[PDB]
Write a protein that binds this ligand. Structure first.
Ligand SMILES: NC(=O)c1ccc[n+]([C@@H]2O[C@H](COP(=O)([O-])OP(=O)(O)OC[C@H]3O[C@@H](n4cnc5c(N)ncnc54)[C@H](OP(=O)(O)O)[C@@H]3O)[C@@H](O)[C@H]2O)c1
Lengths: 364, 364
């Protein structure tokens, strides 16, 4: 028997208020043929995880009594890296020691262990397997734990919608210091796309500009510069010198920021909105729609990959390969380790409260 | 030789300041192959016509000395109905007596005659031709003169982008009392598309509402109702009752209004923005793009039809057939005859000054 812990809530609300820890038992001596038990290695706290708990995110796990609660309760977290510890008699796709991520959203990754079917998981190579296969690197725990959402989001936005001519075309994105933003800059470099990252001003602005440039941003500007009529002709000069066009805007901010990046595209431009700060709506001047053949659409990786295992597979495989090859890098998570001395839900509550410090990964 | 008059301007500004009438000569014996001489029967005044005169609209006819002017001068009007009076050696498509509209924008329809190529025109049936093909009626001058823009825009917005299931599906539009608005309501009814028109409140609301419903708006709401979270479920009931979905939004207002009509669409909705009342950007909640698969695009009849004559004529053929099958009603213009009582440009100048009374048609 296994005494596991899960972070649950019986009612929607702010993580600081509604989360608790529930002890639950998994009978590892009673696996059905296709069942698998996994041990969590690490799971991050993403904004979507928080929005789920708050009740403002339209995709979420059902509240049930399955963790042994009196009242119906839901688990938390959508992304995570797990280690297979035992498999049922009919399981061939996974073996003990293997690394896996959930195959679907709403699995509940803020917990120590899970019991599921073999098809509830997707195998990733563990470091020993990458090394045995001749690869110069294996995945870190943070890389495996965050591979499912942000890297895939960047890659698909860049490649699945409009075709940028290598060596000349441009994308422009806001939220340039975001995890997605940082992956997009790297993928831009890898595919030879030019790009402009728009970021908020900050005390170490110049140092951040230089880091984003090292990742693959061609140019980095502030939101002030994005807003600026004075500065606008400088950006046109960059694009004209390249021989290419700005064809794609990636928006995770909304409001004025969205207006600014849209205005920087050439005719026939496409914006993809994948996020939104401060509840500020996407705001686009009428003239761009009418006179510049501008299109504005959405991106949600959960929905795009819902019924498209093949695209998911192909994309995930490219990200894995790039990690193994040392061609892609993750932003450094702040890791908090669960040892059983502080309730698990409190580790996640701290992580939510400390979101501003960096991406928070709870490890095990 | 034909003695003709044209409404010109030597430079951009307000129609009350800059327009004048120029008499010039059309040689109808010094001809060319593929050439066609036409007499104007009627031409309307549209906002875009005025926007060209003002020099704000980025598509306009060139300034030449070809009307016999001392300084370079541009003609006026993009829409009009004409009669062919003479053709060149190699013109088979057109014949004397035939009715025609311009093939393309920037024709200059605010004048008494024109010499163009036969590819410069598209044939419409004259009343005698329609009636000789067994039709109950033939087009009136107003119907032919005004056919090219507003009925086409509406027909095209409603049919060329998404397919609404007849007797089931809905579109929503703001600027409900606009000319386009009024055609869309009609065409919607003919195609058996359900529709919601949004209009501003006024003291004579009841009368405006009745007039729009007579034209075929299924439901008319105020912008206050458009703004209302409380009223949302009432609209959802309408749509469910019809066993359909709201798939399409037509925006010509922007700001809050654009936000409200977007929110009323079911998942996978499209907004087309074809105008923009006063300063207001297209403003769309992030959640719609991410969670509702919402797309926001532009519409500009000119650009869509620049290199698409098969689509242009196919749409005209349907408008024409409905016309005087007696199934479509034109918007009813206030006409003023160019009968020598006042100079030609003063006729147009008055219709611009008198835009608020309704659509102004100069006849000949
Ligand atoms: N639709 C999808 O498929 C999907 C998938 C992945 C991500 N997303 C979206 O992407 C965003 C988070 O992704 P992530 O994991 O990369 O987050 P992250 O690493 O925590 O980064 C968050 C970003 O948001 C910026 N930001 C915060 N408040 C802002 C404001 N008021 N104005 C402008 N920028 C602001 C931050 O800038 P600073 O560094 O200056 O603080 C930072 O760049 C969310 O909006 C999320 O919904 C959506």
């Amino acid at each position: 028997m296994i005494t596991a812990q899960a972070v649950l809530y019986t009612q929607h609300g702010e993580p600081k208020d509604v989360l608790f820890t529930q002890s639950f038992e998994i009978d590892d001596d009673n696996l059905a043929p296709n069942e698998v038990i996994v041990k969590t290695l690490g799971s991050p706290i993403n904004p979507s995880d928080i929005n789920q708990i708050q009740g403002v995110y339209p995709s979420k796990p059902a509240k049930t009594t399955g963790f042994g609660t009196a009242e119906p309760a839901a688990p938390c977290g959508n992304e995570g890296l797990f280690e297979v510890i035992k498999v049922g008699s009919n399981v061939s796709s996974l073996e003990a020691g293997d690394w896996v991520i959930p195959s679907h959203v709403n699995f509940g990754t803020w917990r120590t262990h899970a019991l599921g079917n073999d098809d509830d998981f997707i195998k990733l190579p563990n470091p020993a397997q990458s090394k045995a296969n001749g690869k110069p690197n294996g995945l870190t725990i943070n890389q495996g734990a965050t591979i499912s959402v942000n890297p895939l989001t960047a890659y698909l936005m860049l490649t699945h919608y409009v075709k940028l001519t290598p060596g000349k075309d441009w994308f422009i994105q806001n939220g340039g210091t975001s995890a997605v933003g940082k992956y997009a800059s790297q993928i831009g470099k890898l595919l030879n796309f030019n790009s402009i990252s728009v970021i908020r001003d900050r005390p170490n602005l110049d140092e951040v500009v230089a880091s984003l440039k090292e990742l693959g941003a061609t140019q980095v500007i502030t939101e002030d510069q994005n807003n600026s009529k004075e500065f606008g002709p400088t950006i046109k000069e960059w694009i004209k010198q390249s021989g290419g066009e700005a064809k794609l805007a990636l928006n995770c901010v909304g409001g004025k920021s969205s207006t600014g990046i849209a205005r920087k595209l050439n005719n026939n431009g496409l914006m993809l909105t994948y996020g939104g700060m401060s509840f500020q709506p996407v705001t686009i001047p009428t003239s761009l729609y009418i006179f510049k053949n501008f299109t504005s659409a959405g991106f949600w990786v959960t929905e795009l990959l819902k019924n498209n295992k093949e695209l998911k597979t192909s994309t995930l495989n490219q990200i894995i390969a790039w990690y193994e090859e040392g061609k892609l890098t993750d932003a450094k998570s702040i890791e908090t380790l669960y040892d059983g001395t502080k309730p698990l839900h409190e580790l996640y509550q701290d992580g939510v409260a400390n979101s501003k410090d960096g991406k928070q990964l709870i490890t095990y």
